[PDB]
């Protein structure tokens, strides 16, 4: 009578429920792993709501008997094999932009915490660092640089990337971006400098920030080789996808000093920990629990959206009844 929809990696349906209360049987598995999923869920689940803390390979998808649509609560669908998925007959959707602002703001924040060193200043005082004379101030703050004039290198001028550029120009930054798959002319409309190769950007940048969607071509975009293409004491800010940066190469660069600092909200291995991993002992390093997207408003907003998508399906028709599908051309 009423199809079944399961919240794979989670156990809170308070928001989605009011929208699927009469068109589905919402339940939760809270399966941090692809195998921790309940049997009957893998058997009788017309739809599925999932976040990011769980990936789905073809090997996994082929286990879902009744699955026909997967809704990713967020703008990132790299943890899902949208292709193998599509070819299997299961539609995959995403929430285009519900936390673009949240991330843009949080991004500029990490950038400021590097240039202004406000995060380390606090931490320093929190440990008994006594600062008396202006002499000491220049010491504890030794590193704080002026932003006026500095060139902000942006890799990926998407929803988030663009928001960052608007805020970037406000601080006097000399913004310039790189986006191969982006249409020509957009730079003019936004009044921004556009390079044609990653090599050019890293060469003309004092601070590089990642805002590109992870895929098969940009994996490990930042590696020992591309790092050599960067400038000395250049800053790095990654609030996109952990696979974009080679934690080992960065950990090495940070230590050698070829990179004056780094801010990371996303990491290769999540959850992240300053104890395990290449960045185990990396200098000048700021990290956040992949929460740049968080906001009580943005959270509910994206969840209510995904909830609608699930209903546009159970009620409408796949895929012509889906507003935000990512494989409408793969099946």
């Amino acid at each position: 009578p009423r199809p079944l929809v399961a919240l794979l990696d989670g156990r809170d349906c308070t928001v989605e429920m009011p929208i699927l209360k009469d068109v589905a049987t919402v339940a939760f598995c809270d399966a941090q792993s692809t195998q921790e999923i309940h049997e009957k869920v893998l058997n009788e689940a017309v739809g599925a709501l999932m976040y990011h803390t769980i990936t789905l390979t073809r090997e996994d998808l082929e286990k879902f008997k009744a699955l026909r649509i997967i809704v990713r609560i967020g703008s990132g669908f790299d943890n899902i094999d949208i292709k193998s998925a599509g070819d299997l007959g299961i539609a995959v959707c995403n929430v285009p932009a519900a936390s673009v602002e949240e991330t843009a703001d949080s991004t500029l924040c990490h950038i400021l915490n590097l240039y202004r060193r406000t995060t380390w200043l606090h931490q320093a005082l929190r440990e008994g660092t006594r600062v008396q004379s202006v002499e000491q101030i220049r010491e504890v703050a030794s590193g704080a640089a002026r932003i006026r004039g500095e060139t902000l290198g942006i890799i990926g001028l998407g929803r988030v990337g663009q928001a960052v550029a608007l805020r970037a120009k406000a601080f006097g930054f000399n913004v310039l971006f790189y986006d191969p798959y982006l249409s020509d002319g957009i730079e003019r409309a936004l009044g921004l400098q556009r390079v044609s190769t990653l090599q050019d950007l890293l060469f003309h940048s004092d601070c590089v920030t990642l805002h590109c969607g992870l895929n098969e071509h940009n994996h490990h975009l930042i590696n020992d080789f591309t790092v050599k293409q960067m400038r000395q004491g250049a800053f790095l800010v990654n609030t996109a996808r952990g696979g974009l940066v080679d934690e080992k190469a960065l950990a090495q660069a940070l230590k050698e000093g070829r990179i004056r600092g780094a801010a990371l909200d996303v990491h290769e291995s999540e959850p992240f920990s300053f104890s395990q991993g290449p960045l185990k002992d990396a200098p000048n390093l700021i990290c956040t629990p992949h929460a740049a997207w968080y906001s009580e408003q943005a959270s509910i907003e994206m969840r209510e959206e995904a909830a609608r998508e699930i209903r546009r399906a159970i009620t409408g028709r796949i895929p012509d009844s889906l507003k935000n599908c990512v494989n409408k051309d793969h099946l």
Partner: peptide
């Protein structure tokens, strides 16, 4: 609202 968590 259904607890489909593997026990």
């Amino acid at each position: 609202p259904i607890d489909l968590s593997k026990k």
